Curated annotation (Swiss-Prot), chains A, B, C, D, E, F, G, H, I, J, K, L, M, N, O, P, Q, R, S, T:
The modification Phosphoserine is found at S2. It is found in: Secreted. The chain holds residues 128 to 151 of 151 of the full protein. Residues 20-24 are annotated as: Important for degradation of atrial natriuretic peptide by IDE. It comes from Homo sapiens (Human). This is Atriopeptin-3. The record marks C3, F4 as: Cleavage. It comes from the Eukaryota. Disulfide bonds join C3-C19. The gene is NPPA.
């Protein structure tokens, strides 16, 4: 395969306990 | 396959316990 | 296959316990 | 609000471009 | 808000470009 | 807010370009 | 495979206990 | 805010370019 | 494989106990 | 804010270019 | 005669010749 | 006659010839 | 799509906090 | 798409905190 | 007649010929 | 897309903290 | 008549010929 | 995309802290 | 009539011919 | 992309702390 990235600003990943998160 | 990214601003992923989250 | 991304702003994915979430 | 949660084994959250994913 | 959480084994959070992922 | 947490074994957080990932 | 990165600004990954996080 | 935490064994946080990662 | 980096500004990775973090 | 922490065994934080990483 | 500002995201003022503009 | 500013993200002022602008 | 203009004397554009302004 | 523009004398653009401004 | 500034991220002022601008 | 421009005398652009400004 | 500045990240002022600019 | 420009006399650009400025 | 500056990161002032500029 | 430029007399550019400035 192949992966080409564009423009990314505020990408966020949370794994596990992430309560009360991602409050944009 | 092939993956081309456009423009992304506030992409968010939460895995596990994510209660009370994603409050845009 | 092939996947081309357009413009994305506030895409959100929650897996597991996500009660009281996605309060846009 | 209370998040108790049981036993969680294979939990996946994909946000954005997730083509050809979650193939169990 | 209380985050207790049980036994978690295979938890995955992918944010952005996650093509061909989460292949169990 | 209280983060107690149980026994966590295989926890993965990928942010950005995570193609061909989380192959269990 | 092959991975080409574009432009990234505020990419964030949290694994484990990440409650009350990602407050953009 | 209190971060207690239990027993954590294989915890991974990848930020940026993480292609072909988290292969369990 | 091969990995080519673009432009990155505020990439952040936290592993373990990261509560009350990533407050952009 | 209090960071107590339990027993942590294999904790990995990769920031930047982390291709072909976190192969358990 | 005071005033307090809340949270603002995308604010635009155009005075004069502003045709074909404000294309959200 | 004081004033206090909150949080601002994308603020734009155009005066004069500003056609084909403010394309959010 | 073009724009020619004309005569402009006291054009004013204000974005954001603009209390007690534009007093002629 | 072009822009020619004529006569401009007292054009004013203000972004951000602009309280008690643009007093003619 | 004082004023206090909060947090500002992307502030733009254009005066005069500013066509085809402010393309967020 | 070009821009010719005519006669400009007292053009003014201000970004940020600009309280009590642009007084003609 | 004092003023205090908070935190500023990307502030731009353009006066005169500023077409095709401020492309955030 | 070119820019020719005409006659400019008292053009002024200010970024940052600019309180009590641009007084004609 | 004093003023105090906070933290500044990317501040730009352009006066005169500044077309095709401020490409953040 | 070129720039020819005409007659310029009292052009002024100020970045940073510029309180009580640009008084004509």
């Amino acid at each position: 395969s192949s992966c080409f990235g564009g423009r990314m600003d505020r990408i966020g990943a949370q794994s596990g306990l992430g309560c009360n998160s991602f409050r944009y």
